[PDB]
Design a protein around this nucleic acid. Structure first.
Lengths: 170, 27, 197, 232, 134, 190
RNA sequence: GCUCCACACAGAUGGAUACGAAUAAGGCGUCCUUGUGGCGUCGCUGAACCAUAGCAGGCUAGCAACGGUGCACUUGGCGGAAAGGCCUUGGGUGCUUGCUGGCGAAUUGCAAUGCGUGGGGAUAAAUCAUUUGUAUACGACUUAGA
RNA sequence: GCUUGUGGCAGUCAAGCGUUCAUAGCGACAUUGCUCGGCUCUUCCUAUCAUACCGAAGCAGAAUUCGGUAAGCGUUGGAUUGUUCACCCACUAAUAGGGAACGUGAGCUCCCUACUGAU
RNA sequence: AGAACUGGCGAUGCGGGAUGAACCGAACGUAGAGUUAAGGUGCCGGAAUACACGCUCAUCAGACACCACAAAAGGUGUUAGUUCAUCUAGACAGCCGGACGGUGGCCAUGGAAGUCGGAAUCCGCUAAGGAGUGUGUAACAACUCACCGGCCGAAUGAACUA
RNA sequence: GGAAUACUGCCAGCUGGGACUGAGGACUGCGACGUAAGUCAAGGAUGCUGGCAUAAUGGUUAUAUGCCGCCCGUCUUGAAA
């Protein structure tokens, strides 16, 4: 499970160079420390630095603005594989920034075998207006009055011996 | 029909093929 | 619980069914499986029909007769299946498949007595709706079992002679569900309800 | 996966697309001011040597074709969407075939010409034909039993497979000659034709269908008047 | 005369009332506010006290009850319409909710109160077996 | 792509009336009746106005979505088969030996004889499926007509009439003998 | 086996509580236009159902029902898949916690669950021995004999 | 996880990968140049020689060639042996290739048990 | 293959890897109780026929183990992406219509008209028509798609990546 | 604008259920509670009650079941052989 972490770092202020540039990035991780560890890894890919050369200025959690609303999430993702790395974009209809990146990570495992070490999340953004939605399986729920059933319902039994012979209507 | 047991001479004669692929890449 | 749990294959998955039928003997549980032939499985037909013959070939060299005997009749097909997860060979084992019994059809004295099923193992309820799934019957036959019919026929009989039964019962109840209904709503009753009953 | 892979083509012609639609869009708008009178033609079905004959009749006046929806939008669709005054009224009336004509000549010289102009053409789908065509019960000929047999050549054995499938007629072949057992009749006078009924009469080379080109709406540029006339 | 038989279902729709099995909420009625995807709906039932949340449809069961609700409706707005349809009265009227009560009410019998039940069921039988064989 | 709700439409004309319980489909009309089991396919029929039927398929895979369109067709062909009927005309040809096709009422089962074909003493007896009727083409030399309700009965029996007349170990081009389906059509042409 | 003597003594603890078929469907109830028919209703676990109070379940007094139930009998019917059981009729005899009674419980001391033998007698048969050869290494097999 | 079918050498090739990316340079299928063994009796394999059914061929018929499924059933006899390390006409539907290691060299120039049967 | 270094076994049991010199854990007095490692929890087997998201149908799937060898590709299996292009100025598919004029271009020749060939592949008309993509003919015809257009009313196609 | 509530963390917060253990043997010590007298959960279990002598109980051997267990010694070689 995930949380979002606002992190800033500044390569310890040397002589004649007071207060450098400050690099802000939103990291999805499971805890504050994974977050920090990830932060430097991204720093080494943007430019030439190291974990000892800099300092974590401020690492603060971000909660989701309205987690009783359903948004749609257009996500940019860089990820490595068996081949050389390559950019991507998917869409996710979801509740929260965080549950979105979460459900993306499952999909990134399921389809492309890539694990959390490989994936950089580039940018996650809400899409406000429809028609900016470029994927079919998302557009699929953006129809007026979507009434459907869930046929063939498995009723999970605790007891091994059932006398009724189970029927699956809903 | 073929089998799906790995005989140990193979199961460890894979490691000793994989080790040869390690020293090959470096040079 | 119940001393004898006459099961019933009719829409189960040879595996699974088994397993559990298994554990249950191991934990001292007199079972009894019926309608073996209406047992099912997974996959096309023209498969089980393989994942078998192969099995068939097997058999012994120097002396074919002494070796992996290929039973045809359903029952047994499914037996095996099961005598295959029970350290059979060891007192505790033998002591099991001792506790077992697998008829094709559903002959007396079981005809007359409630059966049951084993969720955790029905085609309907496990196989992603609409997927290839074999049904012993054929699968036996296809490879020896000489009776599919007898069973069949000398079946239809049962079903009959029963349903008939049924009725007589459905008729009966109705009366009750009626008496109780009427002589329901008078005090006494009421009260109960309060407690719940 | 699994899709209809299109027939691989190595043709010397390229797809026109939008580079042609823009060239037509400007050509209609440049011809509206230069000329004075405009016509819109409902030319139902048109042979190419017939179209070039209308072209070579006069080089002064311009003929305009293309897409119907190109011809709606270059001119005007509504009272807001317009290049000229009351220009949308003529575009709403033309709905069939696209045909249009710009002219600088007299009104009476045009309409008298097009009423008199009627040409020989093949029988067309969904349109009636005034003939009762009967085929002889022996060897069939290129005309199909209208002219004497001595003048005409017997039909090619190569085309008979098509005669059985699309043209339907029960055809057997003896010594390289197409033969039917009974005197076949395809069509009658005063009956609406189907596609196969049309193509039979197209194969035999029968010109038993009158082609008269009709015109509908009329417009003058400086006066901005819309005139409606139903000619045939 | 054309008869296409059966095909009846409960449907995931904006404003279907649901009963949740697994969870902290459990046995408490909420209603679907917005379908997220195939498996997730967004629920809430402020009358019971269960909060507004993403939820797998495996946690929950749909009911033979529904009402008029706008898409993405808020807690106050849900409550209004819930009170407008007055579902609880409709809900507890069903043999479905009556069973859930009948499970619960029996579960909290005293040993003595359970004895009474036996004693009554002794009487209620005598009157019943009287009525039959006539 | 995992669709959500995939439905077709089945247009029902005024003559026929459809009955569908489970996935069994009756088409009762002018020419008679047709029944078909469709349990093997697993879809959802929906009567909408006594005049349109919607088969839907929820949460379908491409292979399950496919299964839907073929159900529209296989009910369409059950409807067209009663209002209009299906008639298949077969003409048979030869080089030297004229084929002497007849129909026998042996054991009341109705078979079609194929005699003398390419000089055969082997008489090829072909069953006739119930529902489908046979009649010889009048005023047309050497032609036979297969007319029935169902598309199966007809076209399958046409196929059994054709496949019996291969030429064993000979040339395709040189030998013309056999029975071929000339024309596919309707009983009532309109 | 019958008869006479002599002796010997793989886990029960309220109830295995009978439709079939489907599961993109089904029960159950009702009206009949007898159907792939309509209307009603159920399911979302057996957490049910039926039994269930009495010295480990006694001894006696009535009331109200005309039922419930146990037991040997008796009439008729069903069950051949491994029927080896399942129903019913008639009477007798118990019991009835359906309702109300009238007596006893202790000291058990504060837990330690509380149908074979060895001889006889009578009679069915097999074997051995003999005989035959269709059988045969030896067996075994086939024959025949109050 | 050994092995089986199309040589190596120089090159018009030409998708991409090469620190930058055709000119660090490789580069797939193609095409240009030279050129001391062999007689019985069992079993299995298919990569099939016949027989079985098909598919293709300017295949008219008869016969042929190529290919497919198939191992059900079949697969010969004579002159050569200074080290057998060659082959030819005679028939037949056809006279296929192999494995089972020192296969049957304890058939060749009073250790244990499989098996056939018997009580 | 050879050289150097550091371990493991050698003097070493114990849990795990179905079984094992080289792997995983863990270096041992005798016990009780607790917690774990490595490995597992359908049944054989102690332990979730657990929950959650997806993916996969295999005519002997897969659970094959520095993802290493047979591996560069093939497939109208399937799910997702990336990059080019059309898209209510009506796309994709589809029956329908046009698909022309110097011209039956020119050498080759009994016969070549787009279509047995050789070298150019022009020009005019238009909405668009290739001195022509095939069927066919002795040669023509007729058919053909490619390019338009009409009837229909929305998303579709191509190259690839995983 | 106003509360909450989850989440993280704290308590020298309170109240339960279960198993295993009871080493040691006068008193000294560190404490706590009490105004004191004293008392205590403070340098390791005490209290009450029940079962028996035709005992209670404990053992031996023969098997049964579950699980585990390559044939001892010597001698090589890197161990298995």
């Amino acid at each position: 499970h995930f949380k979002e972490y606002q992190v800033i770092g500044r390569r310890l202020p040397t002589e004649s160079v007071p207060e450098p540039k400050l690099f802000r990035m939103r990291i999805f991780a499971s805890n504050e420390v994974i977050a920090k560890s990830r932060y430097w890894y991204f720093l080494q890919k943007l430019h030439k630095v190291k974990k000892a050369s800099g300092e974590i200025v401020s690492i603060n959690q971000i909660n989701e603005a309205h987690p009783t609303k359903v948004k749609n999430f257009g996500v940019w993702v860089r990820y490595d594989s068996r081949s050389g790395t390559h950019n991507m974009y998917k869409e996710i209809r979801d509740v929260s920034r965080v549950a979105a990146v979460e459900t993306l990570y499952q999909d990134m495992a399921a389809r492309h075998r890539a694990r959390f070490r490989s994936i950089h999340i580039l940018k996650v953004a809400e899409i406000e207006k429809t028609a900016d939605v470029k994927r079919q399986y998302v557009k699929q729920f953006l129809t007026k009055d979507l009434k459907f059933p869930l046929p063939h319902r498995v009723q999970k039994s605790t007891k091994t011996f059932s006398y009724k012979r189970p029927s699956t209507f809903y | 029909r073929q089998s799906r047991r790995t005989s140990t001479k193979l199961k460890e004669g894979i490691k000793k093929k994989a080790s040869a692929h390690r020293k090959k890449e470096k040079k | 619980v119940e001393p004898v749990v006459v099961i019933d294959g009719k829409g189960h998955l040879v595996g699974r069914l088994a397993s559990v039928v298994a554990k249950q003997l191991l934990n001292g549980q007199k079972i009894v499986v019926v309608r073996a032939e209406e047992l099912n499985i997974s996959g096309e037909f023209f498969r089980n029909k393989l994942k078998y013959h192969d099995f068939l070939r097997k058999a012994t060299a120097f002396n074919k007769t002494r070796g992996p005997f290929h039973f045809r009749a359903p029952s047994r097909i499914f037996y095996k299946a099961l005598r295959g997860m029970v350290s059979h060979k060891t007192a505790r084992g033998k002591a099991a498949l001792e506790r077992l019994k697998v008829f094709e059809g559903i002959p007396p004295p079981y005809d007359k007595k409630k059966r049951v099923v084993v969720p955790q193992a029905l085609r309907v309820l496990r196989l992603k709706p609409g997927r290839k799934y074999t049904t012993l019957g054929k699968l036996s036959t296809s490879v020896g079992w000489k009776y599919e019919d007898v069973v069949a026929k000398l079946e239809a009989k049962r079903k009959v002679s029963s349903a008939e039964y049924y009725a007589k019962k459905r008729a009966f109840t109705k009366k009750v569900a009626s008496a109780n209904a009427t002589a329901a709503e008078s005090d006494v009753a009421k009260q109960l309800a309060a407690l719940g009953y | 996966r699994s899709k209809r892979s299109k027939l691989v083509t190595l043709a010397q012609t390229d797809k026109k697309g939008r580079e042609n639609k823009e060239r037509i869009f400007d050509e209609v708008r440049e011809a509206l001011d230069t000329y004075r009178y405009v016509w819109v033609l409902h030319l139902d079905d048109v042979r190419t040597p017939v179209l070039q004959e209308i072209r070579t009749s006069w080089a002064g006046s311009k003929l305009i074709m293309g897409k119907r929806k190109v011809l709606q939008k270059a001119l005007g669709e509504k009272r807001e969407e317009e290049y000229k005054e009351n220009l949308y009224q003529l575009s709403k009336l033309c709905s069939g075939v696209t045909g249009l004509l710009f002219t600088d000549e007299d009104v009476n010289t045009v309409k008298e010409y097009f009423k008199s102009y009627v040409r020989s053409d093949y029988s067309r789908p969904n349109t009636k034909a005034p003939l009762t065509f009967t085929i002889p019960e022996g060897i069939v000929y290129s005309r199909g039993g209208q002219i004497p047999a001595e003048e005409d050549v017997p039909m090619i054995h190569s085309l008979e497979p098509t005669m059985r499938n699309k043209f339907e007629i029960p055809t057997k072949i003896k010594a390289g000659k197409i033969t039917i057992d009974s005197p076949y009749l395809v069509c009658t006078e005063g009956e609406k034709l189907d596609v196969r009924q049309a193509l039979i009469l197209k194969q035999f080379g029968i010109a038993a269908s009158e082609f008269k080109v009709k015109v509908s709406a009329y417009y003058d540029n400086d006066s901005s008047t819309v005139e409606s006339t139903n000619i045939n | 005369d054309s008869i296409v038989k059966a095909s009846n279902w409960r449907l995931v729709e904006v404003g279907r009332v649901v009963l949740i099995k697994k969870g902290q909420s459990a046995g408490k009625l909420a209603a679907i506010v917005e379908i997220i995807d195939q498996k997730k709906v967004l629920i809430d039932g402020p009358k019971a006290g269960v909060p507004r949340q993403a939820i797998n449809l495996g946690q929950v069961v749909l009911t033979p009850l529904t009402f008029a609700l706008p898409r993405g409706a808020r807690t106050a707005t849900v409550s209004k319409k819930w009170a407008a349809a007055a579902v609880c009265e409709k809900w507890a009227a069903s043999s479905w909710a009556k069973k859930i009560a009948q499970r619960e009410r029996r579960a909290a019998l005293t040993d003595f109160e359970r004895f009474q039940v036996m004693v009554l069921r002794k009487q209620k039988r005598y009157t019943v077996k009287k009525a039959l064989a006539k | 792509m995992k669709y959500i709700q995939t439905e077709q439409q089945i247009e029902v004309p005024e003559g026929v009336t459809v009955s569908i319980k489970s996935r069994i489909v009756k088409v009762v009309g002018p020419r008679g009746t047709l029944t078909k089991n469709l349990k093997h396919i697993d879809v959802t029929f929906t009567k909408v106005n006594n005049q349109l039927i919607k088969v839907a398929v929820h949460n379908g895979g491409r292979k399950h979505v496919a299964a839907l369109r073929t159900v529209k067709s296989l009910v369409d062909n059950m409807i067209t088969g009663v209002t209009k009927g299906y008639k298949y005309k077969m003409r048979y040809v030869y080089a030297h030996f004229p084929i002497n096709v007849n129909i026998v009422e042996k054991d009341g089962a109705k078979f079609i004889e194929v005699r003398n074909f390419l000089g055969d003493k082997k008489i090829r007896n072909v069953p006739v499926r119930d529902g489908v009727t046979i009649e010889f083409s009048t005023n047309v030399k050497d032609e036979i007509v297969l007319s029935g309700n169902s598309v199966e009965d007809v076209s399958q029996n046409a196929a059994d009439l054709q496949q019996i007349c291969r030429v064993r170990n000979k040339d395709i081009r040189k030998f013309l003998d056999g029975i071929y389906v000339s024309h596919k059509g309707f009983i009532t042409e309109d």
